[PDB]
């Protein structure tokens, strides 16, 4: 495994991804960590792995409460992985974060090129 020493954005993003949002598999799994650095809030995904062991897939869900709403959010999703499971997940968290106005829509660019 490697990774960059920083990041940097040059390039032009459409006004209709502010209405659909940026938020990606990668961008929900790290956003949802932020919201619960921010708000001082632990969350941690329940896996379920389906089929049998030589060809399986992994169900994960999270379900979080909102202090600043008065209410709570759920979600279940399934990958071929715990990884791909957890990713679709947050996003499913981060997408009703996005709906009930705790975030906006996200700063990266489209992924086109």
Avoid at 37 to 46: A, F, L, R, T, W
Avoid at 62 to 75: D, E, N, P, S, V
């Amino acid at each position: 495994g490697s990774s960059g020493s920083s990041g940097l954005e040059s390039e032009e993003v459409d006004l209709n991804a502010g209405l659909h949002g940026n938020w990606t598999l990668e961008n929900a799994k790290a956003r949802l960590n932020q919201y619960f650095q921010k708000e001082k809030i632990q969350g941690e995904y329940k896996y379920t792995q389906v089929g049998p062991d030589h060809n399986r897939s992994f169900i994960a869900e999270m379900t979080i409460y909102i202090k600043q709403l008065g209410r709570r959010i759920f979600a279940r999703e399934h990958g071929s992985n715990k990884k791909l499971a957890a990713q679709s997940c947050a996003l499913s968290l981060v997408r009703q974060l996005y709906h009930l106005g705790v975030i906006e829509a996200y700063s990266s660019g489209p992924s086109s090129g």
